[PDB]
């Protein structure tokens, strides 16, 4: 909408400037505008899109958790009125709106035009991630369907990644990391989470010998996140 009059290249340039300035709401708006130009995104551009919205939704998630914790303590004492619930609901609605925006970009029309594994897996992982963030705050009759939407997106991404990417591929590794966290604390499947993280780590370890020094650093960074979680889980 509001970025319709700005050149695609100018939007990308300004997204990079916004990142440097830690202006992530601006960065996300610029990248939404770039997506809405209708052209596919390059690897760099996909990462600008993801970094922008991850920073925006991350602030909302952290705020939601603070408010939810206060709300639970208040229930559970002394009654303080409706304000804690109201304000948690306000932040929650804003968070859901950001997730809906990202999911809308993926559905119109990033995923359907993504044919290469590195783009298609990236976007399907994002779809799983933003349904997962919706699941984190879901409590009603749609929670099961939200969880299954996350699961379905992650599973399609996993199936493609295992067929089309080596086990050290950083996109594949980050997908497996996030799907394992989905299992652990959204699907209440901690054993599946542990199995996935262990198998992913071990198969990546065995493929490191094929990599350059730089690719080795990329892959081992994400492998360490799998290990971090396994240490907390076992």
């Amino acid at each position: 909408g509001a970025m319709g009059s700005m050149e695609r290249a100018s939007l990308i340039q300004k997204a990079k400037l916004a990142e440097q300035a830690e202006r992530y709401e601006d960065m996300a708006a610029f990248m939404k505008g770039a997506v809405e130009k209708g052209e596919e995104l390059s690897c760099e551009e996909r990462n600008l899109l993801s970094v922008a919205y991850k920073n925006v939704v991350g602030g909302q998630r952290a705020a939601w958790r603070v408010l939810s914790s206060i709300e639970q303590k208040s229930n559970e004492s002394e009654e303080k009125g409706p304000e804690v619930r109201e304000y948690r609901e306000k932040v929650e609605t804003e968070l859901q709106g950001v997730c809906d925006t990202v999911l809308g970009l993926l559905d119109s029309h990033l995923i359907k035009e993504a044919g290469d594994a590195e783009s298609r897996v990236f976007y399907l992982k994002m779809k799983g991630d933003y349904y997962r963030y919706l699941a984190e705050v879901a409590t009603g009759d749609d929670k099961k369907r939200i969880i299954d939407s996350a699961r379905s997106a992650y599973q399609e991404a996993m199936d493609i990644s295992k067929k089309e990417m080596p086990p050290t591929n950083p996109i594949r590794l980050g997908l497996a990391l996030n799907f394992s966290v989905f299992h652990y604390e959204i699907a209440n499947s901690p054993e599946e989470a542990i199995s996935l993280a262990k198998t992913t780590f071990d198969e990546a370890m065995a493929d490191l010998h094929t990599l350059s020094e730089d690719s080795y650093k990329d892959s081992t960074l994400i492998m360490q996140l799998l290990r971090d979680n396994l240490t907390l889980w076992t």
Binding site: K54, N55, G58, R65, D129, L177, V181, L225, L226, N229
Partner: peptide, 12 residues
């Protein structure tokens, strides 16, 4: 809440 590691910016 204890948050586990996920991909990308640890922005929350």
């Amino acid at each position: 809440k204890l948050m586990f590691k996920t991909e990308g910016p640890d922005s929350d």
